[PDB]
Subunit: 146 residues, 2 copies
Amino acid sequence: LMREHAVLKLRIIMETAIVRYINESAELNLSHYEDEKEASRILSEHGFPPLNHTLIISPEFASIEELNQKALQGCYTYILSLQARELLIAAKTRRVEKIKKMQARLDKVEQLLQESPFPGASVWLEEIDAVEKAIIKGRNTQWKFH
Amino acid sequence: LMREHAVLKLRIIMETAIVRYINESAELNLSHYEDEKEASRILSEHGFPPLNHTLIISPEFASIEELNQKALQGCYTYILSLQARELLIAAKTRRVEKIKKMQARLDKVEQLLQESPFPGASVWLEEIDAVEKAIIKGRNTQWKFH
């Protein structure tokens, strides 16, 4: 639950700059610039946060100190591998609603970190019920799971 | 050689739409449109060719009839799935020189399709030479290739 909390804050931070780059790409005129150096320089001046895109998309085995220690130490690769497919308005609606779902999930996570008698006590009851119904289904199908 | 000639012509056709889209997308302003159907409509209303991008860039086991039969009958995925990294000036320069290299290679392919005695007569001499020196270098190292 603590790892999920850190990753959700960092993903909110990532996608609520993709949204403003999509909104300001016409005023920004990215085609005018020479290479990745000048583009990263002109993106650092307009208030875009440097991020580590690989650790945010795939945090494989990173502990939480590793995850908040090398996250803000990257570049603008998150914003520069955007396809022109996703500069469209339905893509904007899709990203805004998934940001809303992520922050609702973040509120749910930080509410789950407090409950009695220890944090994460309802999720484990749900998983007990899921394991029980999978065992019952397996015992009925002669462990063939038809 | 017939397969290579066909794929080179089709890839010249594919990239000499992407380069002028990079030249004209600053004022085409695809960020203004709602979804990808309106975008595909307004891209087809300015003369961009519909292409099958997943078979131009990777012809695996397609014969030349089903290469020139179903590849000009695709969509605008080649042009809508461009990253914003691609819109810089150095990437334009690299695509221009890559178009030049493919044009030179297409000229070489049509030049050595017509040679005597049969098409591809010097290429097989070169492969004779490469196999012979690889056999020598394998015999010198007790077939361990140090």
